[PDB]
């Protein structure tokens, strides 16, 4: 059982600063890149920052929304990743998660921060029933989705509980049920549940990689009726 645990959030005013921490266990932390991703009040996921390995001189990349204001760092001896946030804005309000591994397999519970142009498109909602086959899709505004976009699929269950299902287009994350599979179909990335189950009622997000950053889709609300 891998565990990630974020801390340091709270209730702050615009212009202020805050440092988030995340402690990792159950995997070789120092061998994987780590990311911060945030979920805003409008429920959408936004990739914030990544940090690479010691062998990459701890190289970092940021979303344009936070560049120059946020700093990602890590301490491999403490199995920890950090996010220093300066000049906070109302739009930085959200739940902040640390996440990584192939490429978003593991997520912490999140820490809430309240401060007071590629588009990836997914179906808003799909309805299925137990035992059916349902396919969710993920379109890029740049053109066809290819294996060079390293499509990931992540499931959100109630109470902001995120689990990576698929990375690298079609690689199932460890312990993920066999009914989930990833594909490319008609120039879009796709997640298929072959024999949907009642517990699969959830929100499913895709993320696509564009050379040096991720863009998350808006998510698909899957209802499983009957």
């Amino acid at each position: 059982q891998v565990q990630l645990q974020e801390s340091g959030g709270g209730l702050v005013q615009p212009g202020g600063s805050m440092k988030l921490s995340c402690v990792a266990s159950g995997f070789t932390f120092s061998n994987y890149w780590m990311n911060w991703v945030r979920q805003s009040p409008e429920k959408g996921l936004e990739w914030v920052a990544e940090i690479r390995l010691k062998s990459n001189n701890y190289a970092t990349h940021y979303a344009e929304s936070v560049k120059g204001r946020f700093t990602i760092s890590r301490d491999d001896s403490k199995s920890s990743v950090y996010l220093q946030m300066n000049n906070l804005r109302a739009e930085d309000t959200g739940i902040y998660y640390c996440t990584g591994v192939g490429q978003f397999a593991y997520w912490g519970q999140g820490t809430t921060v309240t401060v007071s142009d590629i588009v990836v498109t997914q179906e808003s909602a799909l309805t299925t029933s137990p035992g059916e086959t349902v396919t969710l899709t993920c379109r890029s505004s740049t053109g066809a989705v290819t294996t060079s976009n390293y499509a990931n699929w992540v499931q959100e269950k109630p109470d902001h509980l995120f689990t990576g299902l698929i990375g690298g287009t079609n690689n199932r994350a460890p312990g993920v049920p066999a009914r989930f599979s990833g594909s490319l179909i008609g120039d879009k990335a796709a997640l298929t549940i072959t024999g949907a189950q009642t517990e699969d009622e959830a929100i499913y997000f895709c993320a696509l990689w564009y050379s040096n950053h991720w863009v998350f889709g808006g998510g698909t609300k899957l209802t499983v009726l009957g």
Binding site: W33, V101, G102, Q103, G168
Partner: peptide, 6 residues
């Protein structure tokens, strides 16, 4: 490419 390590 991203972190492609399994």
């Amino acid at each position: 490419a991203p972190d492609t390590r399994p």
